Amino acid sequence: KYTVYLFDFDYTLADSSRGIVTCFRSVLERHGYTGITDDMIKRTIGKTLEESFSILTGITDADQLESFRQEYSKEADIYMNANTILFPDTLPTLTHLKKQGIRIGIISTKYRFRILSFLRNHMPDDWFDIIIGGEDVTHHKPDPEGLLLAIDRLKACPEEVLYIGDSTVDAGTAAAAGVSFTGVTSGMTTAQEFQAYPYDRIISTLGQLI
């Protein structure tokens, strides 16, 4: 039995893909990168901004990637949370878990400040026994640093922890952390793709968690 459910954010608790595609596109196109499709961008969602830019442009220079990251953040300040929506099952699910007395948290590559700002005008404050974002860690998912950090801060036993995500990055993160995984196909990752990694279940919607 799990007493702690930890969630990925993008594509798992919230559909942020419209805001994410808008911000990536503005930056890519200001630098001359054309014919990059929405799907090409969406498939990188949940990688670090630097990883995403590298995949899409082929640039590896640390300075240039940092510069894209900064330019992206600036767009995101404007468009991100305005173009992020809740999933149909987000609020009822998390309400149901909290009534069970399960502890909930978020481990995400998106900046925590960005998540909190989203949460402020969507979820009841303050849901969420712990939130670890991209700025809280040096190494990012699939590195287990953030996940292990959260488990540590909660004084949890990994045996009682379920990690829930939409991507193979998330699946890799749970495995690396030695915690149970439940995949949700609400992102761009299919049930066939999750087969490469350990899981309990693979569900279509978060509501199926209940």
Domain boundary, last residue among 60, 83, 106: 83
Q: Domain check: are 2 and 55 in the same one?
A: no
Residues 93 and 189 in one domain: yes
Question: CB atoms < 10 A from the CB of 38, how many?
Answer: 13
Number of domains into which the chain is organized: 2
Residue 63: how many other CB atoms lie within 10 Å: 8
> Of 83, 98, 133, which one is at a domain's C-terminal end?
83
Regarding beta strands 130-132 and 103-107, do their DSSP bridges make them parallel or antiparallel, or are they unpaired? parallel
Cβ neighbours around 181 below 10 Å, total: 22
Integer Cα distance of 15 and 18 in angstroms? 8
CATH number of the domain to which 53 belongs: 1.10.150.240
Do residues 21 and 67 both lie within one domain?
Answer: yes
77 and 22 in a common domain: yes
Distances (CA, A) of 127 to 4, 26, 109, 148, 210: 13, 33, 19, 20, 18
Among 50, 83, 116, identify where a domain stops: 83
DSSP β-ladder status, 103-107 and 4-7: parallel
Question: What is the span of the domain harbouring residue 181?
Answer: 1-16+84-210
Q: Are residues 197 and 144 in the same domain?
A: yes
- Domain match, 135 and 100 both: yes
Q: Is the peptide bond before 126 cis (omega within 30 degrees of 0)?
A: yes
Secondary structure of the chain in HEC code, one letter for each residue? CCCEEEECCECCCEECHHHHHHHHHHHHHHCCCCCCCHHHHHCCECECHHHHHHHHHCCCCHHHHHHHHHHHHHHHHHHCHHHCEECCCHHHHHHHHHHCCCEEEEECCCCHHHHHHHHHCCCCCCCCCEEECHHHCCCCCCCCHHHHHHHHHCCCCHHHEEEEECCHHHHHHHHHHCCEEEEECCCCCCHHHHCCCCCCEEECCHHHHC
Please indicate, yes or no, whether residues 50 and 104 belong to a single structural domain of this protein: no
Neighbours of 158 (CB within 10 A): 15
Experimental method: X-ray
- How many angstroms separate the CA atoms of 79 and 86, rounded? 16
CATH (domain of 98): 3.40.50.1000
Residue with tokens 């930056």: 27
Nearest to 63 by CA among 71, 194, 76, 55: 71
Say whether both 97 and 168 belong to one domain.
yes
Tell the residue number behind the tokens 């498939």, with chain if given: 43
Pick left, alpha or beta for residue 58 (phi over 0 → left; psi -120 to 50 → alpha; otherwise beta).
left
- How many Cα neighbours within 13 Å face the side chain of 57? 21
